[PDB]
Amino acid sequence: SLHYDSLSKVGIIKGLTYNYKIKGSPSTKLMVVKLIPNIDGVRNCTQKQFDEYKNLVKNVLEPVKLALNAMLDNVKSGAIMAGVALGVATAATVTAGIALHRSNENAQAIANMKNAIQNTNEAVKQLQLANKQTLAVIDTIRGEINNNIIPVINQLSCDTIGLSVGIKLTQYYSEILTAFGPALQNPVNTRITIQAISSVFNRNFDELLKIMGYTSGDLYEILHSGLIRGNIIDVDVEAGYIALEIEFPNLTLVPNAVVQELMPISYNVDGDEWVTLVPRFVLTRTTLLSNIDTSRCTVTESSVICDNDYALPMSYELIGCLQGDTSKCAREKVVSSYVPRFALSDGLVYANCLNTICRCMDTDTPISQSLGTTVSLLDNKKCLVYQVGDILISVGSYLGEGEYSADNVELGPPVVIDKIDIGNQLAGINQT
Amino acid sequence: SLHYDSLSKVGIIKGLTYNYKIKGSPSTKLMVVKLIPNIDGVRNCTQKQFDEYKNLVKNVLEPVKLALNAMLDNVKSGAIMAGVALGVATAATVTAGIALHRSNENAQAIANMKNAIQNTNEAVKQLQLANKQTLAVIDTIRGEINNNIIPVINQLSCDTIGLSVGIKLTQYYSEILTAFGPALQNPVNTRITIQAISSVFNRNFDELLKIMGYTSGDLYEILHSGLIRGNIIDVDVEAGYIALEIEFPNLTLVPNAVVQELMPISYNVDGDEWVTLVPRFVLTRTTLLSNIDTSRCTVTESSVICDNDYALPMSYELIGCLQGDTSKCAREKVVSSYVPRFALSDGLVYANCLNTICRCMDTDTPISQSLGTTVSLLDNKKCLVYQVGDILISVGSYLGEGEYSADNVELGPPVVIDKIDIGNQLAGINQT
Amino acid sequence: SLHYDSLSKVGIIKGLTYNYKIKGSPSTKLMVVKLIPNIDGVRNCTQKQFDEYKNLVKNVLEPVKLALNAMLDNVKSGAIMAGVALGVATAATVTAGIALHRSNENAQAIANMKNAIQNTNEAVKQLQLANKQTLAVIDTIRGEINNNIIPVINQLSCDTIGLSVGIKLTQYYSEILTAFGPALQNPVNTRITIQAISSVFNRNFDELLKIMGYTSGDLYEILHSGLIRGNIIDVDVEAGYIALEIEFPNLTLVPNAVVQELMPISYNVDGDEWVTLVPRFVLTRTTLLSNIDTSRCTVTESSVICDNDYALPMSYELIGCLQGDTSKCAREKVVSSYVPRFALSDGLVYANCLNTICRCMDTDTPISQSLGTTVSLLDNKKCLVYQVGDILISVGSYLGEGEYSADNVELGPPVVIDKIDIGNQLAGINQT
Ligand SMILES: *[C@@H]1O[C@H](CO)[C@@H](O[C@@H]2O[C@H](CO)[C@@H](O[C@@H]3O[C@H](CO)[C@@H](O)[C@H](O)[C@@H]3O)[C@H](O)[C@H]2NC(C)=O)[C@H](O)[C@H]1NC(C)=O
Ligand SMILES: *[C@@H]1O[C@H](CO)[C@@H](O[C@@H]2O[C@H](CO)[C@@H](O[C@@H]3O[C@H](CO)[C@@H](O)[C@H](O)[C@@H]3O)[C@H](O)[C@H]2NC(C)=O)[C@H](O)[C@H]1NC(C)=O
Ligand SMILES: *[C@@H]1O[C@H](CO)[C@@H](O[C@@H]2O[C@H](CO)[C@@H](O[C@@H]3O[C@H](CO)[C@@H](O)[C@H](O)[C@@H]3O)[C@H](O)[C@H]2NC(C)=O)[C@H](O)[C@H]1NC(C)=O
Ligand SMILES: *[C@@H]1O[C@H](CO)[C@@H](O)[C@H](O)[C@H]1NC(C)=O
Ligand SMILES: *[C@@H]1O[C@H](CO)[C@@H](O)[C@H](O)[C@H]1NC(C)=O
Ligand SMILES: *[C@@H]1O[C@H](CO)[C@@H](O)[C@H](O)[C@H]1NC(C)=O
């Protein structure tokens, strides 16, 4: 439970409040990415280039089929994993293996549609499966032929058509190696985001989502957070395609979990300028404080959205600091020319008026701050419009038992923190 | 003030000297990015796809217009911010809000040109505003229609034209969501680099700069450093466009500020190989040393260019080390097979001749180093061409009071530094 | 030498074993990237735009030619570097300078083919040099003209052809500045990966490799690891091209070097849930342990592939921990809702049955764990199929002197580790 009045006196001002969300239950859609295109219309001119290409595709997929079959043979049917056959695995790996087995029904439904997939002549098509599920099938290369070669085909000789298609087949191959590289090497454990899958399809993830029945504008939270992901459930070596299953997860709101932002400003210590060291975000669960590493999460207007729960333990001293004992708040000296010197909270302005400019516009007078005063509070008790630095701002009233003051503030120890500095410091401590 | 003679004896060799620059005053140009294209020529074939598209654009921009109006209503007219209405903000946020108000004059000048923007039929066009400012207007989609559909339109049926344009409209939409995503969610505080804006325009930032009156080759320092940035000043929901203001800042040379590079090499300690731990870059201001985090700056041939002043405090022990007391310089043991074992400074070579190969080519003799000697200096007093490792090099003369030696060098404490290692070490220290 | 039985008792389970590889000897191929295209077929319509373009290219390359000549003049002929003329350099810089001199023979062979390069009319061409080496020559722009303008040229007026080509020339220029930016500023020391070079050629690295005589599928280890790189050996300012030399290195298997993965799980301490802090990867050389920073390496199915040898020293306490003294293993408390609670190793399952669900399926009974027990081992001595969490798994037999137990496990000190937390903690330690 954060204590805001004692924190503001060491320059820590209450910022925005966000709620906390984590990935919830799954929902899936099926997709096929074709590696071997339908080249009807250019077959006689491109015969040489196309046969070379097909052989390369086969060599890429054969090792993938072996990896997928190796895992399927370790699961029998809930489903039981053969621990001895698998030998070594993480809990996540074992779970992925079981999931692959469960998805085999969809893989078979897709395989039985092989002819419909092969005979598709449009870059994007939707097929129906025997189990009433839909399948999104894409062949980027066919699109490029339909748009760039066919409309002008009567102007091109076969040598030109052959060379032109060969370059297209080749650049597509490079896009596959880049987007699915890791997934082809480890098809059981690797997941691919929708924005990465779309890099094979000219980067058009909006089209892929539309086929699967979604509007991009309605998926902002899971799309932007990178939570729409797929995995390889099957491959067909001779047909030349990869079967993916794509997840569109729900989000779970975590009860009694609040993420609070803190806004540090500089403060005065007998003529010197200092800043207090606290984490930007603090996670509170009912009553307890913990650390939240938001560099691994997406922060939105109202929510912090994480894939999993990333709460980390907070040190004893930091909890003591945040709960109101300022003698435990480590501070660092400011040496650079800029640092935030004011902030707005609940309509009031907190500022270091010894390092920035504070004036009352109603009276055209300067605002003083004694050297023993750490921060100054600007409210509407005496003046409505203040000049703070290069801006003018109107403020509200102060709520409290009496006039705000920061005349006798207990400060924590000074620190210098860096990788090299800690090395030198800790060595000095143990050497002495 | 760095002491180079005592530092070279622990393997720290003086490297290149750079000056220091930070962002200076702004200069701006106006731009409009059209989301709804001019489709004259295909209107009858694309009617269905185009109407769906326009509705999606409207839904994307409406929330942006609300965010922009919400901030404008908090500023009245210098301009005064309503702190109570805003409630909670950083100093940066308040400044951004005031800036938005100031840019409203340009937003109105652009709005009054709405018909000229809508009736543009070229991918890139320059318009004149009533206030004698120019406006750069782009519509990437129109370019694609002019280049890929119109020249072959007599070969295409309407079903084909409809589908072909639909895919283009859709992929453009995806590029907008990726490039301006964060900016549409927070249009007041988010800034976009020119190389990111250009990702909507086929990645052609040179064309965008040319229209705005600049040559890319003359903007290397601010272009490469990521300092050319824009922000959203207005949107037009029904017209389907975003109005941006793009900054082309001047750079400020910081007086008496010098950034000095240090080049660590290994050295000998009684048969073991050690390296001293110092920061690669040290910032000096007149006489004082501080840390500079160059991972956040662009380092060029002669300058270190930072957006803001990022100087950080340096620890007491590290200052003592760098100023000549080598007993304060922490060292780490070398366990890997490679480490720099020599360096060139002021025409002279410093090397660890117990771990690498040092020979005099003039006499074809080996160069000895006693076990108590930390580093050896190779100069032209005795030999002109030296073999150092696998290279041959000519050297200059040594400037000093007498022969260089490193026979009695006081060394600092040994350390091992990592995240896990510090955890274990600090725990051991407090537990004991 | 890792001690696995005592480590499993604090939740550290043996994971996968990888071998260790580093970059070996070089092999090279030559390439030319043309900046000034062959525009035969559109010369009369594009005259204005083309002349402006050529002037811009000249201005970009002139400074590069000066940097290259400045270094060549410091090397005479093994080759000898002029240390005085160079002044200040790292060992790496001096080596790069010597290498540039050695590559000058190839630069001359390329220059003598200038007319063959200029008269090439296909996007990708292979030329023969007088020294029997091949040269890969690319001109992306020519490809775009051959594919998008010529087939429809009778439908386009000159104004249209002029504008259309101008946009293509301009976007190409932007791609060059992005891909070779750093290389043009520092042509002696900067290296470019093949996937970055290919970003000038529509991202088609498979085509570039094919011309140079390679199959992408056979280069997975060096291609994916980023070890296929080139450097600028020459430029021709008037002709408008950059000459590159591209390296295709062999890999060296490091003898007696093994990289071992560790898999941490949670464990019980009197009702609390804790996890032990160890590095994920440990490098062993014959008998010695060291740290390996794999974030700088590519991890493949069987190998860890690094550019250079990145072994780092390991602390005394961590070695003691890993070699069997568990009182030296620092631990951290779990506060988040998820943590791995089991793992599979050598067919056996290790689990924390106080925090997850453990049951025997053969008898349909729960598996107990006393509060004083740290971890539980699930083997086939009593039950074949276990339920662990939400999965079912079959297990093998335990190899040892008797029944596995973890009743009296000595634990190391508790820690909280973060950047801020260490700052506060170390300050408290020195202040007290
Ligand atoms: C652990 O605590 C000790 C004692 O405070 C630290 O040693 C002292 O550190 C200060 C800087 O914080 C040194 O500053 C100098 O003090 C003298 C006063 O004699 C003043 O004239 C100088 O201008 C400067 O301010 C002080 O010399 C130094 N004391 C000694 C005996 O060396 C120590 O650095 C702390 N350890 C860590 C890792 O922080
Ligand atoms: C703080 O200082 C103490 C005392 O120097 C450190 O304890 C000692 O650390 C060394 C390694 O630096 C251990 O190495 C061993 O020393 C014995 C000599 O008895 C030698 O035969 C071994 O081959 C090895 O070199 C030494 O055992 C250990 N001393 C004790 C009593 O355990 C301590 O590690 C330092 N703390 C930190 C965080 O650095
Ligand atoms: C270095 O060691 C000392 C001594 O263990 C640490 O001080 C103590 O730290 C613990 C937390 O680890 C504090 O926890 C509290 O203990 C009281 C028992 O009196 C209990 O009732 C509370 O609920 C809570 O568990 C303990 O108060 C504190 N001791 C004192 C005198 O303040 C110190 O934090 C360690 N330093 C570092 C950097 O770890
Ligand atoms: C290739 O096949 C198409 C479709 O039947 C035909 O129109 C074209 O003339 C054929 N080209 C050659 C060289 O046979
Ligand atoms: C569409 O409009 C254009 C321009 O007037 C015309 O040439 C074309 O024939 C029209 N197509 C149809 C299907 O009406
Ligand atoms: C440009 O040159 C080509 C090739 O000789 C010719 O066919 C075309 O008509 C010329 N165009 C003009 C405007 O002279």
mmCIF file with all atom_site columns, N, CA and C in Angstrom, chain A residues 163-183:
data_model
loop_
_atom_site.group_PDB
_atom_site.id
_atom_site.type_symbol
_atom_site.label_atom_id
_atom_site.label_alt_id
_atom_site.label_comp_id
_atom_site.label_asym_id
_atom_site.label_entity_id
_atom_site.label_seq_id
_atom_site.pdbx_PDB_ins_code
_atom_site.Cartn_x
_atom_site.Cartn_y
_atom_site.Cartn_z
_atom_site.occupancy
_atom_site.B_iso_or_equiv
_atom_site.pdbx_formal_charge
_atom_site.auth_seq_id
_atom_site.auth_comp_id
_atom_site.auth_asym_id
_atom_site.auth_atom_id
_atom_site.pdbx_PDB_model_num
ATOM 1  N N  . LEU A 1 163 ? 12.380 -16.418 -66.894 1.00 0.00 ? 163 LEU A N  1
ATOM 2  C CA . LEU A 1 163 ? 13.252 -15.677 -65.988 1.00 0.00 ? 163 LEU A CA 1
ATOM 3  C C  . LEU A 1 163 ? 12.470 -14.878 -64.958 1.00 0.00 ? 163 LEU A C  1
ATOM 4  N N  . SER A 1 164 ? 11.365 -14.269 -65.384 1.00 0.00 ? 164 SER A N  1
ATOM 5  C CA . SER A 1 164 ? 10.560 -13.424 -64.511 1.00 0.00 ? 164 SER A CA 1
ATOM 6  C C  . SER A 1 164 ? 9.938  -14.230 -63.381 1.00 0.00 ? 164 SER A C  1
ATOM 7  N N  . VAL A 1 165 ? 9.379  -15.396 -63.714 1.00 0.00 ? 165 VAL A N  1
ATOM 8  C CA . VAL A 1 165 ? 8.777  -16.254 -62.706 1.00 0.00 ? 165 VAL A CA 1
ATOM 9  C C  . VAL A 1 165 ? 9.854  -16.828 -61.797 1.00 0.00 ? 165 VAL A C  1
ATOM 10 N N  . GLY A 1 166 ? 10.994 -17.214 -62.365 1.00 0.00 ? 166 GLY A N  1
ATOM 11 C CA . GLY A 1 166 ? 12.078 -17.766 -61.562 1.00 0.00 ? 166 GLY A CA 1
ATOM 12 C C  . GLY A 1 166 ? 12.491 -16.827 -60.437 1.00 0.00 ? 166 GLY A C  1
ATOM 13 N N  . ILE A 1 167 ? 12.613 -15.526 -60.736 1.00 0.00 ? 167 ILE A N  1
ATOM 14 C CA . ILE A 1 167 ? 12.956 -14.553 -59.701 1.00 0.00 ? 167 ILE A CA 1
ATOM 15 C C  . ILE A 1 167 ? 11.868 -14.472 -58.636 1.00 0.00 ? 167 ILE A C  1
ATOM 16 N N  . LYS A 1 168 ? 10.601 -14.516 -59.032 1.00 0.00 ? 168 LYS A N  1
ATOM 17 C CA . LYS A 1 168 ? 9.513  -14.478 -58.058 1.00 0.00 ? 168 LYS A CA 1
ATOM 18 C C  . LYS A 1 168 ? 9.515  -15.704 -57.153 1.00 0.00 ? 168 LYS A C  1
ATOM 19 N N  . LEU A 1 169 ? 9.758  -16.883 -57.727 1.00 0.00 ? 169 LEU A N  1
ATOM 20 C CA . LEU A 1 169 ? 9.762  -18.106 -56.925 1.00 0.00 ? 169 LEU A CA 1
ATOM 21 C C  . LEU A 1 169 ? 10.878 -18.040 -55.908 1.00 0.00 ? 169 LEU A C  1
ATOM 22 N N  . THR A 1 170 ? 12.011 -17.536 -56.347 1.00 0.00 ? 170 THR A N  1
ATOM 23 C CA . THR A 1 170 ? 13.192 -17.449 -55.516 1.00 0.00 ? 170 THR A CA 1
ATOM 24 C C  . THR A 1 170 ? 13.035 -16.452 -54.385 1.00 0.00 ? 170 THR A C  1
ATOM 25 N N  . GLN A 1 171 ? 12.478 -15.272 -54.610 1.00 0.00 ? 171 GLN A N  1
ATOM 26 C CA . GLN A 1 171 ? 12.352 -14.324 -53.528 1.00 0.00 ? 171 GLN A CA 1
ATOM 27 C C  . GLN A 1 171 ? 11.324 -14.801 -52.498 1.00 0.00 ? 171 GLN A C  1
ATOM 28 N N  . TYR A 1 172 ? 10.297 -15.521 -52.985 1.00 0.00 ? 172 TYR A N  1
ATOM 29 C CA . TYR A 1 172 ? 9.308  -16.087 -52.062 1.00 0.00 ? 172 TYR A CA 1
ATOM 30 C C  . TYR A 1 172 ? 9.982  -17.069 -51.117 1.00 0.00 ? 172 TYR A C  1
ATOM 31 N N  . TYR A 1 173 ? 10.821 -17.931 -51.683 1.00 0.00 ? 173 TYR A N  1
ATOM 32 C CA . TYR A 1 173 ? 11.571 -18.909 -50.907 1.00 0.00 ? 173 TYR A CA 1
ATOM 33 C C  . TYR A 1 173 ? 12.359 -18.225 -49.793 1.00 0.00 ? 173 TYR A C  1
ATOM 34 N N  . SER A 1 174 ? 13.014 -17.105 -50.113 1.00 0.00 ? 174 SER A N  1
ATOM 35 C CA . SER A 1 174 ? 13.770 -16.350 -49.108 1.00 0.00 ? 174 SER A CA 1
ATOM 36 C C  . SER A 1 174 ? 12.876 -15.820 -47.993 1.00 0.00 ? 174 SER A C  1
ATOM 37 N N  . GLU A 1 175 ? 11.657 -15.396 -48.338 1.00 0.00 ? 175 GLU A N  1
ATOM 38 C CA . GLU A 1 175 ? 10.716 -14.893 -47.333 1.00 0.00 ? 175 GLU A CA 1
ATOM 39 C C  . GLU A 1 175 ? 10.270 -16.005 -46.400 1.00 0.00 ? 175 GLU A C  1
ATOM 40 N N  . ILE A 1 176 ? 10.131 -17.218 -46.934 1.00 0.00 ? 176 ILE A N  1
ATOM 41 C CA . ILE A 1 176 ? 9.763  -18.370 -46.119 1.00 0.00 ? 176 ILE A CA 1
ATOM 42 C C  . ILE A 1 176 ? 10.866 -18.705 -45.142 1.00 0.00 ? 176 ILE A C  1
ATOM 43 N N  . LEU A 1 177 ? 12.106 -18.703 -45.617 1.00 0.00 ? 177 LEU A N  1
ATOM 44 C CA . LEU A 1 177 ? 13.218 -19.034 -44.736 1.00 0.00 ? 177 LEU A CA 1
ATOM 45 C C  . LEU A 1 177 ? 13.353 -18.033 -43.613 1.00 0.00 ? 177 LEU A C  1
ATOM 46 N N  . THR A 1 178 ? 13.049 -16.778 -43.887 1.00 0.00 ? 178 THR A N  1
ATOM 47 C CA . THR A 1 178 ? 13.132 -15.749 -42.861 1.00 0.00 ? 178 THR A CA 1
ATOM 48 C C  . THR A 1 178 ? 11.973 -15.819 -41.859 1.00 0.00 ? 178 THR A C  1
ATOM 49 N N  . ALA A 1 179 ? 10.743 -15.991 -42.356 1.00 0.00 ? 179 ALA A N  1
ATOM 50 C CA . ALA A 1 179 ? 9.564  -15.989 -41.486 1.00 0.00 ? 179 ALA A CA 1
ATOM 51 C C  . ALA A 1 179 ? 9.379  -17.292 -40.700 1.00 0.00 ? 179 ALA A C  1
ATOM 52 N N  . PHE A 1 180 ? 9.613  -18.429 -41.338 1.00 0.00 ? 180 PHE A N  1
ATOM 53 C CA . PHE A 1 180 ? 9.392  -19.720 -40.697 1.00 0.00 ? 180 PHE A CA 1
ATOM 54 C C  . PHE A 1 180 ? 10.680 -20.428 -40.355 1.00 0.00 ? 180 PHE A C  1
ATOM 55 N N  . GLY A 1 181 ? 11.805 -19.757 -40.485 1.00 0.00 ? 181 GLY A N  1
ATOM 56 C CA . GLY A 1 181 ? 13.086 -20.414 -40.268 1.00 0.00 ? 181 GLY A CA 1
ATOM 57 C C  . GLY A 1 181 ? 13.101 -21.252 -38.991 1.00 0.00 ? 181 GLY A C  1
ATOM 58 N N  . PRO A 1 182 ? 13.015 -20.617 -37.814 1.00 0.00 ? 182 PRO A N  1
ATOM 59 C CA . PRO A 1 182 ? 12.959 -21.226 -36.496 1.00 0.00 ? 182 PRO A CA 1
ATOM 60 C C  . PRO A 1 182 ? 11.866 -22.273 -36.354 1.00 0.00 ? 182 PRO A C  1
ATOM 61 N N  . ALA A 1 183 ? 10.750 -22.066 -37.048 1.00 0.00 ? 183 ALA A N  1
ATOM 62 C CA . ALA A 1 183 ? 9.617  -22.973 -36.973 1.00 0.00 ? 183 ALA A CA 1
ATOM 63 C C  . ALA A 1 183 ? 9.850  -24.255 -37.745 1.00 0.00 ? 183 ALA A C  1
#
